[PDB]
Amino acid sequence: PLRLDRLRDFVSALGELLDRHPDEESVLREGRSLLGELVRHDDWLPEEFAQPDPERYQQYLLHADSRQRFSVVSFVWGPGQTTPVHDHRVWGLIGMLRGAEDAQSFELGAEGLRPIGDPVRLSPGQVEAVSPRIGDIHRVFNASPDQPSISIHVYGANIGAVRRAVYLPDGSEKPFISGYSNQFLPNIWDQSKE
Amino acid sequence: LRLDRLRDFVSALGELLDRHPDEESVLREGRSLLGELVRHDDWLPEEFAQPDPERYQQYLLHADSRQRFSVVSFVWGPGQTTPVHDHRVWGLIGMLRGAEDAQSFELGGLRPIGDPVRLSPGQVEAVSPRIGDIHRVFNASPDQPSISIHVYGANIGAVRRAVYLEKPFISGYSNQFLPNIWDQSKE
Ligand SMILES: [Cl-]
Ligand SMILES: [Cl-]
Ligand SMILES: [Fe+3]
Ligand SMILES: [Fe+3]
Ligand SMILES: [Mg+2]
C-alpha cells in the first residue's frame, strides 16, 4: 500500500515553487516545509531505494526535473558508513526519514578543513539546508553501528551530474561527480493503481 | 546506450513548453525534436523494448514534475493492436523499430479517414482534439515487435479518455520502474 502520492505531491509542489523563480532564501524556507511534510511519513519509499550496500553509501535518484532545475535522492548509509567531506555548488535540503545520522559543517582555513560547531544530530522529520551562501561543506554519517539510516535530499540541480569537490584534511580538493546507484527510478505517476 | 539523446529531448521539450506556445507551435517544434531522437536506435534501454504475450506494453520513460508532458515507449508484439481510442491532449508518435500502421477515425459511428498511415523508423505523426484525436495503432509485422516513442501534453497514463466501438479509458503504465537517464558521468 505504498503512499507514492506523497512523493508525487512533493515533486508537483517543488515544481510549482520554482515556477515562481523565487530567491534561494524563499526556496529553502518553502522547500524545507514541503520536505518536512514528506519525511514525517515513512509509508511511501519503495524498498528498492531503501537498501544498504556493504562497501559504500547508496545514492538512489527518485526524480529529476525535465530541465534539471532540481532532483530528489534517497541516501542510504549502512552501519558506520560516511560520505567524504564534500560541497554541493547548489542549494540542498536534507530530510531525515529512518534511523540516526549526524552532519558536521566545515570551513576552509589557513591549515585546511576546520569543523564549524558540533555535529547536527538528525532524527526522523528533521530538515537541514546547505548552499554556497549559508554553508556548503559537510560530511553526513550513520550515527548507528547496527542499523541503516535514510535521508531524502533535494538539490537545485541534477546533483549526480554536478561537478563539485571532496576535501582532504589539509583542504586540498579532488573533483567530485557523485552519479547514482540505481539504473531504475520508481514510477510515481500511475495514479489509477491508487 | 546514448541516454544523452533522451536527456536532451526531455530538456528541449521542457524549454519549449516554458515559452507557453500554442498547440501548432508545440506540434511543429516537438515533431522536429522527436524526429531527431527516433532517427537513432542506440539509446532505448532493453527493459522498455520488451514485448508481452497478452497485451501491448506502455513503458513511461519520463513524466514532467508538473505533468505538462510524458514520454512513453509503446511495444507491440507480432499482430498486437491498441483499441480505437482518443487522447484529449496533443500527442506525437515517433517510429523507432519495426513496422506499424495508424488508422485515423471520425464520428459519423466510427468511419476511417484515409488509408492507414504506414510508419517506418524516423517518421513522426501528430494527434490532438483540434487536428484529429481518434486512431488505432497496430504492428504491421507478423514475426517482429514494433516500438514507437510517444509524447503527450499530460501524464497520459492518468488522462481520463475513451475507447470507441464510448467506454471510459485510463491506460496506466506497464513498468513499476523508469530508466535513470540522469547519470551523465556513466557517459
Ligand atoms: Cl547534502
Ligand atoms: Cl497516440
Ligand atoms: Fe551533502
Ligand atoms: Fe494513441
Ligand atoms: Mg536533531
Numbering used by the authors:
A (entry chain A): 5 to 198
B (entry chain F): 6 to 113, 116 to 172, 177 to 198
Verbatim from the authors:
Thiol dioxygenases are a subset of nonheme iron oxygenases that catalyze the formation of sulfinic acids from sulfhydryl-containing substrates and dioxygen. Av3MDO exhibits the classic thiol dioxygenase cupin fold consisting of three N-terminal alpha-helices followed by a series of 11 β-strands forming the cupin β-barrel structure that houses the enzymatic active site. The moderately hydrophobic dimer interface buries an average of ∼1260 Å2 (1199–1322 Å2 depending on the specific dimer pair) or ∼13% of the total monomer surface area and is structurally similar to the dimers observed for 3MDOs from other bacteria, all suggesting that it represents a physiologically relevant assembly.
The optimized crystals diffracted X-rays to ∼2.2 Å resolution and belonged to space group P31. Analysis of residual electron density maps revealed two strong features near the Av3MDO iron center, which could not be successfully modeled with aquo ligands as was the case for Pa3MDO. A chloride ligand was bound to iron in the coordination site assigned as the O2-binding site. The carboxylate group simultaneously engages in an ionic interaction with Arg168, which is situated adjacent to the iron center. In comparison to the homologous residues of Pa3MDO, residues Tyr61, Pro88, and Phe180 of Av3MDO are shifted inward toward each other to occlude the potential passageway. Notably, the difference in Trp81 rotameric state results in different arrangements of the “SHY” motif between Av3MDO and Pa3MDO. In combination with spectroscopic simulations and optimized DFT models, this work provides an experimentally verified model of the Av3MDO enzyme–substrate complex, effectively resolving a debate in the literature regarding the preferred substrate-binding denticity.
